[PDB]
Structure 1
Amino acid sequence: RPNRLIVDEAINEDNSVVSLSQPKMDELQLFRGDTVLLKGKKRREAVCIVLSDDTCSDEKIRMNRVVRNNLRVRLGDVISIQPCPDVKYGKRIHVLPIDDTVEGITGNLFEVYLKPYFLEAYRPIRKGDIFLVRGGMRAVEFKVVETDPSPYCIVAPDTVIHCEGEPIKREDEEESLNEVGYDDIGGCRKQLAQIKEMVELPLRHPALFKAIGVKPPRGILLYGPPGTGKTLIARAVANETGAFFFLINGPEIMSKLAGESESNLRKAFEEAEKNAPAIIFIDELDAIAPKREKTHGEVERRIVSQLLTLMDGLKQRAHVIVMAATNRPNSIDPALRRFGRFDREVDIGIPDATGRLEILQIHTKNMKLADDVDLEQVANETHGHVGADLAALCSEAALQAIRKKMDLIDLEDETIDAEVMNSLAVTMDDFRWALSQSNPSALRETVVEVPQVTWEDIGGLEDVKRELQELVQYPVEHPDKFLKFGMTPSKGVLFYGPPGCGKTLLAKAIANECQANFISIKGPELLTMWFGESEANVREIFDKARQAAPCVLFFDELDSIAKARVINQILTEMDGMSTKKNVFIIGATNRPDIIDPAILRPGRLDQLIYIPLPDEKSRVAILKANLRKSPVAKDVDLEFLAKMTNGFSGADLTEICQRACKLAIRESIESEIRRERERQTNPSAMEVEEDDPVPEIRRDHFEEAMRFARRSVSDNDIRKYEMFAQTLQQSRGFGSFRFPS
Structure 2
Amino acid sequence: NNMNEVGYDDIGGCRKQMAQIREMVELPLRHPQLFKAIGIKPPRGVLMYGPPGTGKTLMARAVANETGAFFFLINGPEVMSKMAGESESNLRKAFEEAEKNAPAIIFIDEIDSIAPKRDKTNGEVERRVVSQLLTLMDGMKARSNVVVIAATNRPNSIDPALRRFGRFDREVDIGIPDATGRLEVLRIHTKNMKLADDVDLEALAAETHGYVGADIASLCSEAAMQQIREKMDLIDLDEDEIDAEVLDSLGVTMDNFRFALGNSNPSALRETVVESVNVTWDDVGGLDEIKEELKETVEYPVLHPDQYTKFGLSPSKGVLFYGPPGTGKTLLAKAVATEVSANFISVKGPELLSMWYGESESNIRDIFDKARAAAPTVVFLDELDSIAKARGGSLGDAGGASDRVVNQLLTEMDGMNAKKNVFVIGATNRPDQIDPAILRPGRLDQLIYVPLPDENARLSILNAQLRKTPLEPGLELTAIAKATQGFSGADLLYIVQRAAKYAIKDSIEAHRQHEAEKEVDPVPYITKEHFAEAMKTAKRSVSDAELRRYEAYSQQM
Q: Say yes or no: TM over 0.5.
A: yes
Out of 649, 657, 660, the residue aligned to residue 489 of structure 2 is 649
Cα offset for 1:274? 0.9
Rounded to whole Å, the distance in 2 between the matches of 1:306 and 1:478 is: 52
Aligned to 2:407: 571
What is residue 74 of structure 2 aligned with on the other side? 248
Q: Does 1:199 align with 2:29?
A: no
Q: Supply the distance in 1 between the matched residues of 2:227 and 2:299 (Cα, whole angstroms).
A: 45
Taking the aligned partners of 2:188 and 2:538, their CA distance within structure 1 comes to 46
1:520·1:554 contact (CA, 8 Å) conserved in 2? yes
SS of residue in 2 equivalent to 1:555:
strand
Tell me: CA distance 1:333–1:262, structure 2 relative to 1, closer, same or farther (3 Å): same
The one-letter code sitting in structure 2 at the alignment partner of 1:198 is Q
Find the counterpart in structure 2 of residue 42 from structure 1.
Answer: none
Q: Does 1:260 align with 2:89?
A: yes
The CA distance in 2 between the partners of 1:619 and 1:402, in whole Å, is 50
Secondary structure at the aligned position of 2:360 is classed as coil
CA distance in 1, matches of 2:495, 2:101: 63
The answer to whether 1:322 aligns with 2:149 is yes
2: distance between equivalents of 1:268 and 1:721?
A: 80
Which residue does the alignment assign to 2:312? 482
Deviations 1:266-323 (A, max 9, x none): 3587599814xx6x65433332334546534222233334555667789999796734
Counterpart check, 1:535 vs 2:353: no
Q: 1:708 to 1:631 in 2, by over 3 A?
A: closer
1:652 Cα deviation after fit? 7.4
2:424 matched to 1:593?
A: no
| 1:557–1:590 CA contact under 8 A, matched in 2 | yes
Name the SS for the 1:612 alignment partner: coil
Which of 286, 289, 309 aligns to 1:462? It is 289
Residue 202 of structure 1 contacts residue 216 of structure 1 at CA under 8 Å; is this kept in 2?
no
Question: How far apart are 1:259 and its partner, in Å?
Answer: 1.1
Structure 1 counterpart of 2:410, one-letter code: M
Cα distance per residue 1:451-490 (max 9 Å; x no partner):
x99977757453675589689958974456437xxxx776
- Contact 1:223 1:347 (8 Å CA) reproduced: yes
Aligned: 1:700 with 2:517: no
Q: Distance in 1 between matches of 2:556 and 2:298?
A: 18
Aligned letter for 2:489?
A: S
Whole-angstrom CA distance in 2 between matches of 1:423 and 1:457: 43
RMSD: 7.0
Structure 2: gaps spanning 5 or more residues: 28-33, 197-202, 508-519
Deviations 1:320-355 (A, max 9, x none): 6734143x5555556556785574434569x99x98
Letter in 1 for 2:384: L
Structure 1 runs not aligned, ≥5 long: 1-172, 186-191, 370-375, 411-416, 668-692, 732-741
How far does residue 523 in structure 1 lie from its aligned partner after superposition? 1.6
Change (3 A) 1:472 1:396: closer
Pair 1:175 & 2:20 matched: no
Give yes or no for contact 2:117–2:158 (8 Å, CA) kept in 1. Answer: yes
Whether contact under 8 Å (2:378, 2:425) holds in the other structure is: yes
SS of structure 2 residue aligned to 1:248? strand
Kindly state the Cα deviation for residue 725 of structure 1 after the two structures are TM-superposed.
4.4
Residue 126 (structure 2) pairs with residue 300 (structure 1) = yes
Shift of 1:591: 3.2
2:546 is aligned to 720
Within 2, Cα distance between the matches of 1:626 and 1:598?
39
Q: How far is the alpha carbon of 1:522 from its aligned partner? A: 0.6
Match of 2:449, SS state, is: coil
- Equivalent positions of 1:609-620 (< 5 A) are 609-613=448-452
Which residue of 1 is the match for residue 199 of structure 2?
Answer: none
- What amino acid maps onto 2:19 in structure 1? E
Q: How many pairs align?
A: 475
CA distance in 1 between counterparts of 2:273 and 2:344 reads 6
Residues 250, 283 of structure 1: 8 Å contact kept: yes
- Counterparts of 2:409 and 2:88 in 1: how far apart (Å)? 43
- 1: CA distance, partners of 2:347 / 2:216: 26
Q: Secondary structure at the match of 1:530?
A: coil
Secondary structure of the corresponding residue to residue 76 of structure 2:
coil
- Give the aligned residue type for 1:527: E
Contact 2:47–2:171 (8 Å) recurs in 1: yes
Which letter does structure 1 place at the counterpart of 2:447? L
SS in 1 for 2:127: helix
Q: Secondary structure of the residue that 1:175 maps to in structure 2?
A: coil
| Secondary structure at the counterpart of residue 173 of structure 2 | strand
State the SS of the aligned residue for 2:361.
coil
Task: Give 1:325-474 correspondences, 5 Å limit.
Answer: 325-326=152-153, 328-333=154-159, 336=162, 341=169, 343-347=171-175, 419=242, 444-446=270-272, 460-462=287-289, 466=293
Indicate how the Cα distance of structure 1 residues 500 and 234 shifts in structure 2: closer, same or farther if over 3 A, else same.
farther
Partners of 1:198 and 1:217 within 8 A in 2: no
Q: Is the 8 A contact 1:218 1:320 kept in 2?
A: yes
SS in 1 for 2:382: coil
Distance change (3 Å), C-alpha of 1:281 and 1:727: same
Q: Judging changes above 3 Å, is the alpha-carbon distance between structure 1 residues 202 and 592 closer, same or farther for their aligned structure 2 residues?
A: same
CA distance in 2 between counterparts of 1:504 and 1:216 reads: 56
Residue in 2 that maps onto 1:62: none
- Measured against aligned partners, the alpha-carbon deviations of 1:76-123 in whole angstroms (never above 9, x if no partner) come to xxxxxxxxxxxxxxxxxxxxxxxxxxxxxxxxxxxxxxxxxxxxxxxx
TM-score (norm 1): 0.45
Q: Which amino acid aligns with 1:175?
A: M
Q: Provide TM-score, normalisation by structure 2.
A: 0.56
User: Is 1:501 aligned to 2:334, yes or no?
Assistant: no
Say which structure is richer in helix: 2
Q: Distance in 2 between matches of 1:705 and 1:245?
A: 80
1:200 shift after superposition: 1.8
Deviation at 1:447, TM superposition (A): 7.7
Please list, as runs of the form range in 1=range in 2, the aligned pairs for 1:512-523 lying within 5 A after superposition: 518=343, 520-523=345-348
* CA displacement at 1:649 relative to structure 2: 2.8
Distance in 2 of aligned mates of 1:542 and 1:217: 35
CA 1:530–1:283 in 2, change beyond 3 Å: closer, same or farther? same
Percent identical: 36
Q: Which amino acid in structure 2 is aligned with residue 595 of structure 1?
A: I
Give the SS at the match of 1:727.
helix
CA contact (8 A) 2:472 2:527 kept: no
Select the structure with the greater relative contact order (CA < 8 A; seq sep ≥ 6).
Answer: 2
Distance 1:392 1:461, change over 3 A: closer
